[PDB]
C-alpha cells in the first residue's frame, strides 16, 4: 500500500520537524527577557466613543493616516469614521448585511468588506460622482469570507471559510492566486509590513505562513488547542502572534519556526476574537469574549492593562500606524478610542 | 464653537448620516428575521416558494408585516463560526422532511437522513446563541410519508418505536422525538406544523409563531415578563 507508506513518511517528516524545532531551542523568551524592566501598569482611557452602528460590530480597520476608520456591523452599513472629531465621513449600505470583515486601502482610495455572501466587495471611496459605489464584487470563494487585506489598490488577499486564502486582481476581478493547505476554515489574516508574506490562522488550530508571489505555504505553526480567530505580525515582520478559543495568545517567530511565549491567565477562560500589536511590539493587545481587552507584555507574558468598558464581546481591534491610539470594536454596537 | 466652516459642514454631513442611519435602523427593527435551517435539500425550497452562492435572502410581507428569511444552505463550513450572526433573529424555521426516515444520507455509511435531522435539530435548539429563540419546526412532505409508511415501517428508523403503522400515530411520535431534543423547555417554545407539498396555511402558522415571540418580547419591555 502506497498510502500507508506515505502516511509513515509524513509522520517521519513531522517527527523530523519537531526534532529540529526541539534541538534548535535553547533559551526561551522568558529566560532572556526576565532580566529587563517590566512595562508597569498600562492604563488607557476611552478618548472617543463612536456611536451610530445599531447591530454587533464585527470588524474594523484603521487608515494609514491614523485618523480615518472603517467599521462593519450586521446593520449592512460600512461607516467611515473621522476618529479625531467623531464624525461619519461615509456610510456605505451593503448588499449583504452579514458582513464579518472589512479592510481599508493603504492609499485610502478603497474599502473592502465581506461575509456570509462569500464575496469581497470593493468600494471606491473617492469617486467623481461624490458617492461611495461598488468598484467590483470579488466572487469565487465557496465559504464565508472571514478576512480581507489590501496589498495595494489592485491587489487584495481574502481569507475565507472554505479552508482557502485567495489573492485577487481588482482590475480584472479574477482569482490570481489560491492559497490551499488549511484543514479548518481560515478565520484570520495578517499581512507583513513589506507585503511579501502573510500569515493566516484557521480552525485546524494551525497558522500558516504563505508567500504572495509564489502562492504556496512556507511554514506551518502549531501549538493552539482550539480555533484560531486572530493573527497579527510583529512590527518588524519577523514574528507574529495568534489568538484562539483556548484563552491563550501564542507568539511565533518566522526564523526560529517555533512558539516563543504563551500569553494566558488562569482567570481568563473565554476565547480571543482580535489580536493587535503596538508600534514597538512591546504591548500585545487582545480582545476577548469576557467583554474587555487585555494588554499583554508581549515580551514577558504579563497583563500590562485591561481595557474595560464594553458591554458585549470585543470583536475587533486596531492600532494606528503611528501607534498613537488603539480602537476596540464590540458586539454592543460601539467603537472606543484609547490612549 | 472653535470650528471652521468646513468643520461645521462636515459635522452637518455626519448628522445627516446619523439621521439616515436612524431611519434605516427603525425600518429594520420592524422587520422579522427568520433563520431557515434543515438537513440538506429536504423541504426548504417548497417552503420558500410557499411564502414567496452564499446566504439567500427571501423577502415576503404577510398582514402588513415584513419578513426577512435567511437560507444558510450551501454554507459548508463550521456552523459555530457564523451561527452567532443570527443570535438576534425572531425565530428559527426548521424544515424537516418526513419521507426520509428510511432513506440514507449517502455521505456516511449506514447514516440516516432522519437521524442527521435529529442531530442538527439538537445542535441548533440547544445552542448557546438560541437559548430564548423559538423554533418553528416544519415537518415537510406529509402526504408522501403517509403513502410510503404502508410500504416501509418506521421501526427501521426508530427501533424503540412500537406503535401502529398509521400516519397520525407515527407522525405524532416523530414530532415528540423532535420536541424531546429541546433541553430548554422552560425558556423557549417549539412550534410544529405538518406541511404538504402544496399547503396554503404555512405563512399563517409562521405569522402566529412570530406573533407569540413578539408578544414575549413586548412583555419584557413593559417589565412584566
Amino acid at each position: 500500500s502506497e498510502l500507508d507508506q506515505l502516511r509513515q513518511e509524513a509522520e517521519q517528516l513531522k517527527n523530523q520537524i519537531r526534532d529540529a524545532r526541539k534541538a534548535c531551542a535553547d533559551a526561551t523568551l522568558s529566560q532572556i527577557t526576565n532580566n529587563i524592566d517590566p512595562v508597569g501598569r498600562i492604563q488607557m482611557r476611552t478618548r472617543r466613543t463612536l456611536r451610530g452602528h445599531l447591530a454587533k460590530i464585527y470588524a474594523m480597520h484603521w487608515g494609514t493616516d491614523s485618523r480615518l476608520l472603517v467599521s462593519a456591523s450586521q446593520d449592512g452599513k460600512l461607516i467611515i469614521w473621522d476618529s479625531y472629531t467623531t464624525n461619519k465621513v461615509h456610510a456605505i449600505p451593503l448588499r449583504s448585511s452579514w458582513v464579518m470583515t472589512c479592510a481599508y486601502a493603504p492609499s485610502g482610495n478603497y474599502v473592502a468588506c465581506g461575509g456570509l455572501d462569500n464575496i469581497c466587495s470593493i468600494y471606491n471611496l473617492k469617486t467623481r460622482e461624490g458617492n461611495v459605489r461598488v468598484s467590483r464584487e470579488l466572487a469565487g470563494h465557496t465559504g464565508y469570507l472571514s478576512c480581507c487585506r489590501f496589498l495595494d489598490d489592485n491587489q487584495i488577499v481574502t481569507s475565507s471559510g472554505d479552508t482557502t486564502c485567495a489573492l485577487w486582481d481588482i482590475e480584472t476581478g479574477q482569482q490570481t492566486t489560491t492559497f490551499t493547505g488549511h484543514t479548518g476554515d481560515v478565520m484570520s489574516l495578517s499581512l507583513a509590513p513589506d507585503t511579501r508574506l502573510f500569515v493566516s490562522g484557521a480552525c485546524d488550530a494551525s497558522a500558516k505562513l504563505w508567500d504572495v508571489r509564489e502562492g504556496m505555504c512556507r511554514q506551518t505553526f502549531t501549538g493552539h488547542e482550539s480555533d484560531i480567530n486572530a493573527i497579527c505580525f510583529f512590527p518588524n515582520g519577523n514574528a507574529f502572534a495568534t489568538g484562539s478559543d483556548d484563552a491563550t495568545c501564542r507568539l511565533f517567530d518566522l526564523r526560529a519556526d517555533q512558539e516563543l511565549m504563551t500569553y494566558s491567565h488562569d482567570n481568563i477562560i473565554c476565547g480571543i476574537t482580535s489580536v493587535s500589536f503596538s508600534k514597538s511590539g512591546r504591548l500585545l493587545l487582545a480582545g476577548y469574549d469576557d467583554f474587555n481587552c487585555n494588554v499583554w507584555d508581549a515580551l514577558k507574558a504579563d497583563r500590562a492593562g485591561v481595557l474595560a468598558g464594553h458591554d458585549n464581546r470585543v470583536s475587533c481591534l486596531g492600532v494606528t500606524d503611528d501607534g498613537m491610539a488603539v480602537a476596540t470594536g464590540s458586539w454592543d454596537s460601539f467603537l472606543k478610542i484609547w490612549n | 464653537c472653535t470650528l471652521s466652516a468646513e468643520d461645521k459642514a462636515a459635522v452637518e454631513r455626519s448628522k445627516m448620516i446619523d439621521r439616515n442611519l436612524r431611519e434605516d435602523g427603525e425600518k429594520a427593527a420592524r422587520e422579522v428575521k427568520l433563520l431557515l435551517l434543515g438537513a440538506g435539500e429536504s423541504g426548504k425550497n417548497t417552503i420558500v416558494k410557499q411564502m414567496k452562492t452564499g446566504i439567500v435572502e427571501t423577502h415576503f410581507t404577510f398582514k402588513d408585516l415584513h419578513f426577512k428569511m435567511f437560507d444558510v444552505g450551501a454554507q459548508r463550513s463550521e456552523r459555530k463560526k457564523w451561527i452567532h450572526c443570527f443570535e438576534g433573529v425572531t425565530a428559527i424555521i426548521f424544515c424537516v422532511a418526513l419521507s426520509d426516515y428510511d432513506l440514507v444520507l449517502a455521505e456516511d455509511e449506514e447514516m440516516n437522513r432522519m437521524h442527521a435531522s435529529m442531530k442538527l435539530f439538537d445542535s441548533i435548539c440547544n445552542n448557546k446563541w438560541f437559548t430564548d429563540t423559538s423554533i418553528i419546526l416544519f415537518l415537510n412532505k406529509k402526504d408522501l410519508f403517509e403513502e410510503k409508511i404502508k410500504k416501509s415501517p418506521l421501526t427501521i428508523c426508530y427501533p424503540e418505536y412500537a406503535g401502529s403503522n398509521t400516519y397520525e400515530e407515527a407522525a405524532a411520535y416523530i414530532q415528540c422525538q423532535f420536541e424531546d431534543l429541546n433541553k430548554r423547555k422552560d425558556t423557549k417554545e417549539i412550534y410544529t406544523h405538518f406541511t404538504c407539498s402544496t399547503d396554503t396555511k404555512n405563512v399563517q402558522f409562521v405569522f402566529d409563531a412570530v406573533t407569540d415571540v413578539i408578544i414575549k418580547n413586548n412583555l419584557k419591555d413593559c417589565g412584566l415578563f
Epitope: G130 | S4, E6, A10, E12, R13
Partner: single-chain antibody
Framework: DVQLVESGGGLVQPGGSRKLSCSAS????????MHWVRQAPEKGLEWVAY????????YYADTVKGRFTISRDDPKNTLFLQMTSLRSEDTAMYYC??????????????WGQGTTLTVSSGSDIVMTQATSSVPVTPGESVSISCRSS???????????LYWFLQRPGQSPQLLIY???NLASGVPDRFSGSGSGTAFTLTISRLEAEDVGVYYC?????????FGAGTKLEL
C-alpha cells in the same frame, strides 16, 4: 459626466425680479452643498450665496442678503437663485458652483458654465493679489502671490486657501483646495504653498494651456472672498 447647466439670465430692467436655475446631472446633487458665484464684466469673481446639503444652512453675501434667495429641489437636481430688486451692480455672469464638505474633500471642484444676466440703466477677510497682469514665457516657471488680511490657518491645521484658474471664455476650475492640495484632473506642475497670510502658487513648465486669470479664495469663514485676479499673458 458631471455637468451644471445654468439658465434664466437675460436683460433686466432695474428693480425687476428674475430667477436663476441650475440643472445638475452626473453627480449626487443631494450630497453637495451648492454656491452661487457671479463675475461682473470687470472680471472679478464674487461669491453670492450658499446652500448646504439638506438646505439646513444658507449664507448670503452682504450685498445680496435679504434681496436674493437661494433654494434647491433635490428631487429634480435643480439649484435656484430667486433674485428681487435687481440693480445695476447685479449685472454679472452667475456661476453655479458644486462643493462637498468632509475630511479630505475637495469643495469648489466643479463650476458650471454660467448664465449672463444684464441689468439696464468691514469685518470680511480681504484677499489681495499684488500683481494683476504679468507676462510669462511658455516653458518657464511662474509664481502667483496672494495675501489675506486675516490668517487662513485654523486651529485644526488647515489653511483654507483655494486657487482657481479661469481660462478665457471658460468657467473657473479648482487647482489647489487647501493651500497645498492638488485637485483632481489638474497637472502636477501646479503647486501651492504658503503660511499664515502669505500665499504663492507655482506653475513650473508653463504651457499655453495655463493662460488665464488666477484667483485666490478663502474658506475660513463666510462670506467667501476672492482675490482681484492675476492674469497670465503671452
Amino acid at each position: 459626466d458631471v455637468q451644471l447647466v445654468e439658465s434664466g439670465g437675460g436683460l433686466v430692467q432695474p428693480g425687476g425680479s428674475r430667477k436663476l436655475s441650475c440643472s445638475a446631472s452626473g453627480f449626487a446633487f443631494s450630497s453637495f452643498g451648492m454656491h452661487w458665484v457671479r463675475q461682473a464684466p470687470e472680471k472679478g469673481l464674487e461669491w453670492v450665496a450658499y446652500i448646504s446639503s439638506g438646505s439646513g444652512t444658507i449664507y448670503y453675501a452682504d450685498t445680496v442678503k435679504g434681496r436674493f434667495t437661494i433654494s434647491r429641489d433635490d428631487p429634480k437636481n435643480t439649484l435656484f437663485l430667486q433674485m428681487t430688486s435687481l440693480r445695476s451692480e447685479d449685472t454679472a455672469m452667475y456661476y453655479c458652483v458644486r462643493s462637498i464638505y468632509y475630511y479630505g474633500s475637495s469643495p469648489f471642484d466643479f463650476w458650471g458654465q454660467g448664465t449672463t444676466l444684464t441689468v439696464s440703466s468691514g469685518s470680511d477677510i480681504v484677499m489681495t493679489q499684488a500683481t494683476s497682469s504679468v507676462p510669462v514665457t511658455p516653458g518657464e516657471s511662474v509664481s502667483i502671490s496672494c495675501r489675506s488680511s486675516k490668517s487662513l490657518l485654523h486651529s485644526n491645521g488647515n489653511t483654507y486657501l483655494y486657487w482657481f484658474l479661469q481660462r478665457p471664455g471658460q468657467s473657473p476650475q479648482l487647482l489647489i483646495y487647501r493651500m497645498s492640495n492638488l485637485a483632481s484632473g489638474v497637472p502636477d506642475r501646479f503647486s501651492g504653498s504658503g503660511s499664515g497670510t502669505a500665499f504663492t502658487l507655482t506653475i513650473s513648465r508653463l504651457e499655453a494651456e495655463d493662460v488665464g486669470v488666477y484667483y485666490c479664495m478663502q474658506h475660513l469663514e463666510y462670506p467667501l472672498t476672492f482675490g482681484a485676479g492675476t492674469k497670465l499673458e503671452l
